[PDB]
Design a protein around this nucleic acid. Structure first.
Lengths: 100, 60
RNA sequence: UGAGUAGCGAAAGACGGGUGAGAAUCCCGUCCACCGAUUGACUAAGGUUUCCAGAGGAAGGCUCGUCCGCUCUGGGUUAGUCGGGUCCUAAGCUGAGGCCGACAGGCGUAGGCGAUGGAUAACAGGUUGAUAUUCCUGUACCACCUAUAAUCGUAUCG
RNA sequence: GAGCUGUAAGUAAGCUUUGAUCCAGAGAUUUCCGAAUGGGGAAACCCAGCAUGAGUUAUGUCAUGUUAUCGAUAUGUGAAUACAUAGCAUAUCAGAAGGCACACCCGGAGAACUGAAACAUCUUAGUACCCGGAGGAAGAGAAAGAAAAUUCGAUUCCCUUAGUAGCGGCGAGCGAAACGGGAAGAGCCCAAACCAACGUUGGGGUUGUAGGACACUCUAGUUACAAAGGACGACAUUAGACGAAUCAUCUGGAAAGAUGAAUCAAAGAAGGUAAUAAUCCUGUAGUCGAAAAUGUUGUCUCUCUUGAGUGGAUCCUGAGUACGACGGAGCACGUGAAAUUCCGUCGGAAUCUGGGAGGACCAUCUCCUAAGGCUAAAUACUCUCUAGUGACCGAUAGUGAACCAGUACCGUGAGGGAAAGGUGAAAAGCACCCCGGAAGGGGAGUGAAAUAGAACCUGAAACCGUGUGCUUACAAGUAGUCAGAGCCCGUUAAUGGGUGAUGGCGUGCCUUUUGUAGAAUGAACCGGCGAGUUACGAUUUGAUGCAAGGUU
C-alpha cells in the first residue's frame, strides 16, 4: 500500500521507467500523484482574472496499480509484506527482509 | 477528542449557560449582519453544549 | 402530403419627440374616439405570491417586441375594538350507559359539536416603490390588577 | 492506521499520529400528527382543570408532572323495598385496543358469467369477495378404529391401489378408501366410587388380554404436553488480520497481446488496472481473531417423587346425553335399500347378564369402550437477512419504474399512469485572435482521434436539399418488359457499366368468392415490436436394450 512520501517506479504508461516521489494520494478512487509524470496542458480561468497568462501545466493523478515500491539495498521494484516484528505492524520488502 | 466535562455538577450548569447564551448566540448575530469570519467556530460550540448535556443525563 | 392553403377570437386611431444592433406594436406629449345602473369605486367565495424595484429577450404571447400576469436576483402583509376562537344556539352530525342484530354493525337518552342568525369596546386625518379602522399624530371607550380617599358592616356576592 | 467535512464539483473557515473521517456492540437524546387516550377538530391545529416552581408591587404569559373509555380485583358502598342486590366516589395493575407478508392455516357467511352445443336438478364452486381469531407453523391426534389373516395397534405427509369401486336429467361430469412400500415416531392428565377437613381444599384414583374404590403381608427430575422459578461450559452470530510466484524485446496514445527465456500452485473462482494478466492491484485455497451483546447446546446444582401380584357378598366408570320422527347439511355417495358423523324443533334409554360398531334390518360370531381436556416431529408458505447458481433479459427487452417513479400528468373522489441509460484511459471541458448586441461560427491549442465539444460511442430508412454525365415543350402513359440507334464512362474482367430517339406485348398487391382492373375489404410512408406453446395422460410410427419375460 502506497502512502504519501515514498519513492516509487512507474511500471506501465507513457512515462514508464521513471521514478518520482508520491506527493498526493486519492484513496477513494485509488489514485496517486507522482512528481514528474502525467503532465497535462490546462487553459485555466477564461473568465476569471488570475491575472491569466497563458497555459499552465501540473501533474495528473496516476492509478495506484502502476507504481511499485523500491528496495533500500538493491534499488529494484519489489512487492511488500508484513513481518510484525515490532509492536506496530511494519512493512518489509519481498526480495529481502529489510524495512521499506 | 476535546471533552470539557472534567468538572463537577455544580459548575457544570454554569458552563451550559456560558457556552450557549453568551457564546453561541453572539456568533449568530455577527453572521447575519455579515461581520463574523472563522465560521467554523459555530460547529465547535454546538458540540461543546451537547457533550455537557450527555454527561449530565448520564449521571442521573 | 393537402400548402405557403384556412385561420390569426366582437371594437378608432393619428403624429411629434425619446430609448436602442433592430420600433405600426415599449416610454413621454398632444389631438381624436368608446363606456358611464357602468368597460368606474368597494367586498364574499375561489385562486395561492400572479403584488413592488432593478436587470434579461432563448422558450411562452396566435405578428413584432428594447415590453409583460414570462426569466433572474433582492424585497413586501404590523390590530384589546375591524372579521373568526377563549360567548349562545337552527337544521344536521355524533353519542357514556342503553335497545337491536350471522359478523361488520344499526338506532338512540343525558351530554357535546355545528352560522348563512342572536349577542359584543374607535373614529377623523397624515404617510411608502409595495401595508392601513393595524404604523405615526389628535381626542376617546372597554374587561381586569394593585396601591390611596368619601363612606363602613344586614353593607356585600348569589 | 492518514487523511477527511454524503450525493456534488465550487468558494470559505477548520479538525487529525496527543490516533480524525470511517466499520461492528451497547447506551443517551428523540419537536408535531397518527389506536391518539384532558376537551374539541376540516390529521400535523385550537382551547382548558389540578400539583409545587420561574417572572412581577400585582393580574397577563411560560416550564415540568398529571386528568379518555372499557375490563378485573380491593375499599366508601346508607335506592324506589324497611334490612338489602342497582346508581355513584376515589385509589391500584408493560390488563385490553391499533398495525403489517393482500403468502401459508382454522372458522362464520357465500355469487355469477361459464359447461351441459337451449335450460331449471347438476356443473363452474364451497371457488372469488367480505368478516373474526390466531401461529411460526396451523389443524389433526392416544381407538365406542381398521379387518375376517394363525391379525394389526394414536395422528399428519409422500408413492401405489386407480381413473378401479361407486355416484349421476345414469346426461355433462364428479370420484374414493383399506391392504402394501417409505419419511417421522414419547404419551399422559381430570369426573365419579373413597378418606381426613370447611356446595367446598387436600389425598386417593383413570380402564376392555376389564379397571378402580374396598380387603389381606409387602415393599427415577424428561420445564415441548406430563407441576413449574433460578446461579450453572463449549460451539455459533454480529466488526476484521495475514496470505505463494516475471522480467525483457517489437507494434501502439497506452501491453495484459505477439516473439523469448523463467517462476508458483491445498491458490488456473472473479473483478479491476490506458487493449486479452495464475505471478501489477483488490482477492482466492488454507490458517488465525472478540472487548460487548444475542443464540444453540451441554456436566453438576435446584424443584418435584415408594413400585407391583392377589381382590366383584357390596359400590364407581361422563344424561335431557345416546337414540327416534320431522326439515336441512356433510361424508366420492343428488333421499335412494343409506349405514357411519352434525345443526334447529319435539319426544326420549340402559347401568358389565351393561353399551357401541362390522353399509337397511334380525340372529350368532369377532373387535372396541361415546357423551371432559392437553400433546413435540415428519407438512405448507416468504414482506425479509446472509452466501451463491442460470444452454434467463440486455434499455419498444427485464419489475409499471437501470432513471431521484407510483413521480410529471389525468379525475370531486375511489382510482388510473407514462417518457428519459453510453464524451474520453484521464476534463486534459477549446488560453488568445477575428465577424457579431447576443446566439452561433472561422482559425490557433488540448487529445491517439473534436464529423469524440456535454442536443457529446457506432449513426440505418422514410424525408428535406446543393452540384453534375445522358435525356425531355404534337404528346393518350399499373409507368415495366423484349427488340434498338446515338451519346458518355472504364469493371470482382466478361457474350462490360450509365442514359434511352423509336417499335412490340401488358388493366397493382392482399383478403373473400360460382366469379374481382373492380366502383367489394384492408394499407399515407419508413423503422422496431407483434400469433399452434408447455406440463400431464392416450394412441400410432422410427430408433435402441433385453426377451417368456420386460421395468422400477
Amino acid at each position: 500500500h502506497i502512502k504519501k512520501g515514498d519513492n516509487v517506479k512507474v511500471i506501465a504508461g507513457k512515462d514508464k521507467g521513471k521514478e518520482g516521489k508520491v506527493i498526493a494520494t486519492l484513496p477513494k478512487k485509488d489514485r496517486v500523484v507522482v512528481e514528474g509524470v502525467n503532465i497535462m496542458k490546462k487553459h485555466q480561468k477564461p473568465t476569471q482574472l488570475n491575472p491569466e497568462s497563458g497555459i499552465l501545466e501540473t501533474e495528473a493523478a496516476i492509478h495506484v496499480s502502476n507504481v511499485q515500491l523500491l528496495d533500500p539495498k538493491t534499488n529494484e521494484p519489489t512487492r511488500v509484506g508484513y513481518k510484525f516484528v515490532d509492536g506496530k505492524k511494519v512493512r518489509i520488502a519481498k526480495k529481502s527482509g529489510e524495512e521499506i | 477528542k476535546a471533552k470539557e466535562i472534567r468538572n463537577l455538577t455544580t459548575s457544570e450548569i454554569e458552563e451550559q449557560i456560558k457556552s450557549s447564551k453568551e457564546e453561541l448566540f453572539n456568533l449568530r448575530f455577527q453572521l447575519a449582519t455579515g461581520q463574523l469570519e472563522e465560521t467554523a467556530r459555530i460547529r465547535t460550540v454546538r458540540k461543546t453544549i451537547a457533550r455537557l448535556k450527555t454527561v449530565a443525563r448520564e449521571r442521573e
